[PDB]
Amino acid sequence: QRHSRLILAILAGLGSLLTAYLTYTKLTEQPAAFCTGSDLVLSSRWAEFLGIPTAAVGLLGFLGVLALAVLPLPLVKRWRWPALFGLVSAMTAFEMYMLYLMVAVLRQFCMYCTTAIILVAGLGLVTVLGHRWLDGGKLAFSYILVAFLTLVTTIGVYANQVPPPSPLAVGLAAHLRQIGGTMYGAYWCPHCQDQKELFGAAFDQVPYVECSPNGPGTPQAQECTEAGITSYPTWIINGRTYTGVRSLEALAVASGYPL
Ligand SMILES: [Hg+2]
Ligand SMILES: [Hg+2]
């Protein structure tokens, strides 16, 4: 109701728990190549960061705030209320990029993902509202520092996630072009993107049939059903149908390209 850091502690609970959940989800997942048709944006790319699940990155942060909201008072007097600023600010930086992706690049809504953000959104709004240097503008800057320092790392670490496209990719793309080799799949599907990852620069050459232009759970485009496509990144290469992400390695086998 008024001036209370316990309100942080609570929101850190919910943050922690939800975050712990999706961690246990991605960790227990039974992996797949096709994605015929819990959530898709949730097990997109990005959801895995630096080794650990992004949920886990979320975890470290969320219980990291919980502890500081609760651990005080000797051992760390001066340091806890700003350390509690630096972590929440850094979470806000990360929230914004996730939110960005969600809205802008993935274009799909994820209700676990929105929750997490709303939670952090709140984690700031409360953390903002302490006595806070008789309201200094040192925040304004301090925030802009930490926010921006994070968005160079986060955006950095995500762009360094995708590996430099294989040497094979260039030829295998322009070959599949020749021998009619076609990839049927949905733009939304994490794996139709997974396959598109492996080719990279080269993918612009690869014969691609988009199957579901208008989102998930809406009629699959006509070209696809006529070729009997039932899952999402299937390959029709010379009468033979490969149902699932294949390596550049294995597509070169299936397509006659000498590896
Ligand atoms: Hg060829
Ligand atoms: Hg695709």
Curated annotation (Swiss-Prot):
Changing residue 113 to A: Abolishes enzyme activity, also with dithiothreitol as in vitro reductant. Disulfide bonds join 35-38, 110-113, 189-192, 211-224. Inhibited by ferulenol. The chain crosses the membrane at residues 6-26, 49-69, 83-103, 109-129, 139-159. It is a multi-pass membrane protein. The record marks 35, 38, 189, 192 as: Important for the reduction of the redox-active Cys-130 and Cys-133. Its EC number is 1.17.4.-. CDD domains: VKOR_1 (cd12916). Residues 27-48, 104-108, 160-259 are periplasmic. Thiol-disulfide oxidoreductase that catalyzes vitamin K-dependent disulfide bond formation in periplasmic target proteins. Belongs to the VKOR family. This is Vitamin K epoxide reductase homolog.
